Amino acid sequence: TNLCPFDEVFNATRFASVYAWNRKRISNCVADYSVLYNFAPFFAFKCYGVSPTKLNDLCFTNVYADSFVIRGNEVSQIAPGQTGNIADYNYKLPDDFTGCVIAWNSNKLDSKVGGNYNYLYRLFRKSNLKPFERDISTEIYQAGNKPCNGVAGFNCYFPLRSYGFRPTYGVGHQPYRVVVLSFELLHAPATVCGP
Amino acid sequence: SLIEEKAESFLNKFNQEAEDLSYQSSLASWNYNTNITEENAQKMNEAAAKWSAFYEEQSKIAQNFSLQEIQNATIKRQLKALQQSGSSALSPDKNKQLNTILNTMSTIYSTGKVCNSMNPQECFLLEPGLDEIMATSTDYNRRLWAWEGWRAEVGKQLRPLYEEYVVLKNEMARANNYEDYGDYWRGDYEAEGVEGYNYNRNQLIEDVENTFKEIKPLYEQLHAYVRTKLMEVYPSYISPTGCLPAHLLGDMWGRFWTNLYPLTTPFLQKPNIDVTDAMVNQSWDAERIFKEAEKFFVSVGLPQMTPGFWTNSMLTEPGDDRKVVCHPTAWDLGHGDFRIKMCTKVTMDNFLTAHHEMGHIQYDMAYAKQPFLLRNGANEGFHEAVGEIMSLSAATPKHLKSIGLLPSNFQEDNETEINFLLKQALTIVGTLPFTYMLEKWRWMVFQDKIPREQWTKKWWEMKREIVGVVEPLPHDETYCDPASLFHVSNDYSFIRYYTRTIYQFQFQEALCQAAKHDGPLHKCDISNSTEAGQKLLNMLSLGNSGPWTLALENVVGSRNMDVKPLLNYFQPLFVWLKEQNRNSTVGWSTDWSPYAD
Ligand SMILES: *[C@@H]1O[C@H](CO)[C@@H](O)[C@H](O)[C@H]1NC(C)=O
Ligand SMILES: [Zn+2]
């Protein structure tokens, strides 16, 4: 057998920021759901378009794993058909989504006394993001008629901002890790199957 | 339109920066308070400096947006709150002069010393010796000379400074488009917004006046009961048909009348209710008091404490090589962190104080979801009103029976109820008119109404007219009596106590009638009532977003304050006082003077 690698997505030391999430494609391997239940808490485990109960009979062509780190309050915004900051400027899911969203706490590893300022999120954008689209541009935002001309100031702002987690914040502001599994069945031989 | 988006973006950036900056400053402050060290004080200083500078810069830059152009009913309030930082709208020289004089007044009040005529070696300070001698003494002469020395030392050094502080404060207020400084203080209570709940500053005086007209009939009766009793200790001095001496009220300024209790207690046969012996026998712990308080708070449906509350907050004295200033406080450091600091001891007073602080924490948790600039109370007195009503509900005898400290077969006696009501009256009704009169005097002096050369005479004329306190010695115009109080010398407002006293009894009556209770109002509990918790939480979560009139209508159902609940609360005491005072007279005359022959 050739087991699908559900280790780099669930045991990785470092996770990327929201505005540049990590995408991994997997095919032609053996998928097992027992490895998925590797962590006891599973604060959020929500599945759309598939049976949450054990269903390995269905075989798909491609499986996509999208990983990032968000706050506790924004976990409810990773859903099909939601409005907000993260769901409108950072990461958007379509209405025909068929997959599963998993979110679990990571305070013990992503919190420092001084503050972890590596994680970032985008705050200003001209137009809402299309589904499954990422933006990594860092031009200076311009909300005014006067041209900004490449310098911050009045009515000129820098898009990206930092979280800065600490290990005494509340449960709602603690760092959480989110992984989304998407299943795609294109016109191709079936590759991903069960044991 | 085009400006709404700009205002929204500016507010978003301001909130994003302000949350982190305020959390850093508050964390540094708590770190200093937990352990006193020069390093902690320094770190607190640089923590506060950056916050002040950023706030000043944001307030300066926020004025570029016109108020009338925008309309959102939520952005306008935030921008108005941010722009109202005109304390810097003065020329720098006047700013330095005002800061220097404020520092000088505060320091000279802190370092005040009074020495004895017989021997200049002792020179008693305020905290070590003056308070205790003013609280638990009996000799007339010692109180008289201590009072006179304190008043002289304070006034002769504080009058000229206050005379110039007033002018600079008036200039500062006028630089911010205000009539005077009294308007600046009264601008906290102004509520503008949806139609029907509009509140103007100028009404705040008139309403207060009306309230006083319903407190006088009860207060006078109390003034009788003390007076006769005060003639037992001091036979020759106090006259039946006159007022009361200033230094015989049991306190340095006569603000509270609690210390008169051992001399004016009605019944000496049985003591009050103290369950400290039950706690000692039952082997209670500091954590148990807070657990019981949390259980009481949960019993009405309010959310329980966070799992960081027990781990982070300190609830017991360290008892080792650590230095902590002892004062019960509730800290809302931001970013969903809440703490209480308290030198907990096994005694009923600490139990009630824990209830008060937990009420503060519950309110802070309740209004957390609002934006940063509106993350405060509706007015000044709401926090303390909530704390007081929680303490009053927690201190009842039936609650103590339910806990188990008191025996099940209890025979409550009416005399104990009368004693408790007398203590509560001495705590509240004794201090209400003093607050009213001091606030009125300050309001009149700021409005350029009372002349510069008739300050003390008018002060004592009002003191003899309203409260009924007569000076034992005559004071020349060089003295400055009002400067002897902490709030006057340190530039704090004073009407918040009056407003909180009015509000707390309305809240108590509303929660009691929502809790399906009948009978006397001083035996009521809000416990085991989800309706009362829902009614309270419907208001506790509004915060500063809307006018306080809407919140008050949500709680009690009235647009304005009322004083009838206090009278309903104290009705049995009023009846007993009228019953006892048939022989004596009611009221005082302004003709008496003790030093006059
Ligand atoms: C995988 O997760 C657990 C965490 O305790 C542990 O086996 C190890 O630290 C992680 N990494 C591996 C096995 O490479
Ligand atoms: Zn308090």
Residue numbers in the entry:
A (entry chain B): 333 to 527
B (entry chain A): 19 to 615
Paper lines:
The trimeric spike (S) protein is the major glycoprotein on the SARS-CoV-2 envelope and is responsible for engaging the ACE2 receptor for viral entry, and thus, it is a prime target for vaccine design and therapeutic antibody development. To unravel the underlying molecular mechanism of the S proteins of Omicron BA.2, BA.2.12.1, BA.2.75, and BA.4/5 bound to hACE2, we determined their atomic structures of the S (BA.2, BA.2.12.1 or BA.4/5) or RBD (BA.2.75) in complex with hACE2 by cryo-EM or X-ray crystallography.
The house mice, pet hamsters and rats live closely with human, which poses potential risks of interspecies transmission of SARS-CoV-2 and its variants, and thus mouse/rats/hamsters-to-human transmission routes deserve to be continuously monitored. Compared with hACE2, H34 is replaced by Q34 in ghACE2, mACE2 and RatACE2. The binding affinity decreased ~2-fold with the Q493 substitution at this site. Notably, hydrophobic contact between residue L79 of the ghCE2 and I79 of the RatACE2 may also stabilize the interface. However, in our study, mice, rats and golden hamsters displayed an opposite response (decreased binding affinity) to the R493Q reverse mutation compared with other species (human, rabbit, horse, pig, goat and sheep). Notably, BA.2-R493Q mutant has a significantly decreased binding affinity towards mACE2 or golden hamster, and slightly impairs the binding capacities of BA.2 to ratACE2.
